[PDB]
Amino acid sequence: QNNDALSPAIRRLLAEHNLDASAIKGTGVGGRLTREDVEKWLAKA
Numbered sequence: 700q701n702n703d704a705l706s707p708a709i710r711r712l713l714a715e716h717n718l719d720a721s722a723i724k725g726t727g728v729g730g731r732l733t734r735e736d737v738e739k740w741l742a743k744a
Contacts, residue, residue: 702729709734716741 704727705713705720712734713720724736 703727704731706732706734709737712737 704725709732713723713732716737718737718740720732723732723740725732726736727733
């Protein structure tokens with residue numbers, strides 16, 4: 700319960716860019732994908 704992966708807002712973002720969590724960075728708390736991670740991919744893409 701205290702170990703999520705994708706965030707509500709981010710899910711919308713990834714949905715916008717049409718990307719895959721497994722295809723983008725992720726360093727939250729317990730294996731996840733953060734908006735900052737999406738940024739890294741966005742900048743490195």
